[PDB]
């Protein structure tokens, strides 16, 4: 069977990639992702200038997933642009970059710098609209960001969206996104935002920033992610959907693809296991496809049955 | 040692009650709740006329909790009002009624009928603003509901709120809530809405309504529930917060109370175990308290520690 995905002119060996934020902040991280069995990789959501991020502790591994308030620690746009122009081996896998300016102006200035590298190297942009006020939760601000970034970048790009939990919100988000033809992929989803974990032994929160409030990832998010994937697969047929959330196995990948996902992103589980996970995910998805008699992902993508 | 709670002019033997929707639709359900070791009970979110709800399957138990699209099945407001006025034994425990009119006008008519019974029996109102755009996700609609209900009911009442996932949303919700002094309790939280569960074997969704989309309950929602409880505990200090989400043990109950919860509601776990859980929860909470040297709930309520 084939795990290949053919999108934006590129051939991906498999649908699997890292979720933005995990094993993607430094050059060592990026080499490790490139040397992995992953089909692609994405860089840490970057800012115009370097950020060191939030105070410690800011990450807590849970039995059911993860909580985090990292604070967008990143080496700055110039670092990721340089990796994309001079360091990355595009013969290994295609490269994506996440940009998370804390204002539309910052995002425009960054996006402008990427244009020449995309043209020469094929580096794909994922605009983050779900950085912990979340842009995805204001449909007016979202339109402004897509307007301004579409004009500045002038090239195909995608968007990391916050999870929606309302059918009307799926509709309202789809209506904005469908007014922007340069948005070719929608990544669903970012962390379930602003959760609180408390340790019963010390009666204390487990992360220092934001009084313990942090984004939830892992097993807590699979149902939410699958829903967002399917809702945007159906409402945005002129676009691709990338799945992110709750993937620990080939089974969860299969479910993401069945819901409509082209690429599948792994976060918490990759934070837990390391890049060796990509080799397990390829093997498990292959086994599932072999058992169901699917020869390509295209035979079942978005083909989830309803009653 | 005491698990007692003095709120809303009442004494509650303990903080535990059922979550609206679970063991509260029929009189048999309400008798079993009154006969339980629970401190209170709440009736099913009712509509002006009776409803049979959605087609089957409409509920699916999961390893990590529940997915549901019940469709607000209820025997009509007249039935719940009759239970509150004639059947319910107030010497056993205080009674709550959940009202979920699908319009402002419907809710107004329903709450107007409650006024005389609240005056005579003490029946307490929880207004559902989180029934499957969900009212709580539209702050202008929410203000209207609150304005009209305050006008028509004219007595202290409570609100069932949807889970929020954004700091600005917490602030915006509280701002609306803090303009209505008749709102004395905020129940956080209703289901994490519009999730999607797919069975990998049959490639099919597990609930029939809404193409498989339903509200999530159980272990999936605890960190979200704790966050909303604490956020409204801090932002709405002239009000009480009720905790709802992910309670399967005394541990989860302790955590909710530490975050600010006066009453703790139990849904998915009650569906799984039956009304006996109230006896286990009472015992497990006392155990934790004995092990921590606590005699009353007031010694730890809202005393979650930050760093
Ligand atoms: C430590 C950490 C850092 C993250 N950083 C980013 C980030 O920079 N940009 C982003 O768009 N998402 C970021 N995320 C969110 C993940 O990409 C992903 O959307 C979320 O964790 C859900 O996927 P999972 O269930 O596989 O973890 C981060 C998550 C974690 C745990
Ligand atoms: C079968 C079922 C029916 C529910 N019906 C209602 C309802 O009528 N009104 C309501 O406000 N919440 C309703 N809920 C939500 C619960 O009250 C609760 O907010 C949610 O299940 C999260 O708590 P849990 O983690 O204990 O399940 C329902 C939940 C379930 C599982
Ligand atoms: O860097 C972070 O804090 C971060 C960014 C983002 O978009 N999502 C997340 O969960 N964390
Ligand atoms: O009856 C239902 O469908 C229902 C109502 C509500 O408020 N919440 C929920 O999860 N289900």
From Swiss-Prot, chains A, B:
Subcellular location(s) of the protein: Cytoplasm
Biological process (GO), any one: 'de novo' UMP biosynthetic process
pH-activity relationship: Optimum pH is 7.8.
Coarse class of the protein's main subcellular location: cytoplasm
Active site: 131 (nucleophile)
Enzyme class: oxidoreductase
Essential cofactor(s): FMN
EC number(s) recorded for this UniProt protein: 1.3.98.1
Co-factor note (free text): Binds 1 FMN per subunit.
Pathway(s) per entry: Pyrimidine metabolism; UMP biosynthesis via de novo pathway
Family matches, as Pfam families: DHO_dh (PF01180)
Reaction(s) catalysed by this chain's protein: (S)-dihydroorotate + fumarate = orotate + succinate
Gene Ontology cellular component list: ciliary plasm; cytoplasm; glycosome; nucleoplasm
SUPFAM superfamilies (alphabetical): FMN-linked oxidoreductases
InterPro entries reported for this sequence: Aldolase_TIM (IPR013785), DHO_dehydrogenase (IPR050074), DHOD_1A (IPR033886), Dihydroorotate_DH_1_2 (IPR012135), Dihydroorotate_DH_cat (IPR005720)
Positions bound to substrate: 44, 68-72, 128, 190-191
Entry keywords, A to Z: Cytoplasm, Flavoprotein, FMN, Oxidoreductase, Pyrimidine biosynthesis
Assembly description: Homodimer.
Protein family: Belongs to the dihydroorotate dehydrogenase family. Type 1 subfamily.
Protein task: Catalyzes the conversion of dihydroorotate to orotate with fumarate as the electron acceptor. Molecular oxygen can replace fumarate in vitro.
Name of the protein described by the UniProt record: Dihydroorotate dehydrogenase (fumarate)
């Amino acid at each position: 069977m084939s795990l290949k995905v053919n999108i934006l002119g590129h051939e991906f060996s498999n649908p699997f990639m890292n979720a933005a934020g995990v094993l993607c902040t430094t050059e060592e991280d990026l080499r490790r992702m490139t040397e992995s069995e992953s089909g692609s990789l994405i860089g840490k959501s970057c800012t115009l200038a370097p950020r060191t991020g939030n105070p410690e502790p800011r990450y807590f591994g849970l039995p059911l997933g993860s909580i985090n308030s990292m604070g967008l620690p990143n080496l700055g746009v110039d670092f990721y642009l340089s990796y994309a122009a001079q360091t990355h081996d595009y013969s290994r896998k295609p490269l994506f970059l996440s940009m998370s300016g804390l204002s539309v102006e910052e995002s425009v200035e960054m996006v402008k710098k990427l244009v020449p590298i995309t043209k020469e190297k094929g580096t794909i942009l994922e605009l983050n609209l779900s950085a912990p006020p979340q842009v995805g939760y204001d449909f007016d601000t979202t339109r402004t960001y897509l307007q301004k970034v579409s004009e500045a970048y002038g090239l195909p790009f995608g968007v990391k969206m916050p999870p929606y939990f309302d059918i009307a919100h799926f509709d309202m988000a789809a209506a904005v996104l469908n007014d922007f033809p340069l948005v070719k992929f929608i990544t669903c989803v970012n962390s379930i935002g602003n959760g609180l974990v408390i340790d019963p032994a010390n009666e204390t929160v487990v992360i220092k920033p934001k009084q313990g409030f942090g984004g939830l990832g892992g097993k807590y998010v699979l149902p939410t992610a699958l829903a967002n994937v399917n809702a945007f697969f159906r409402r945005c047929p002129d676009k691709l959907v990338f799945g992110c959330g709750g993937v620990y196995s080939g089974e969860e990948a299969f479910l993401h693809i069945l819901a409509g996902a082209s690429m599948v992103q792994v976060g918490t589980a990759l934070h837990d296991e390391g890049p060796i996970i990509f080799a397990r995910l390829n093997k498990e998805l292959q086994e599932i496809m072999t058992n169901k008699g699917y020869k390509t992902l295209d035979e079942f993508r978005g083909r989830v049955k309803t009653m």
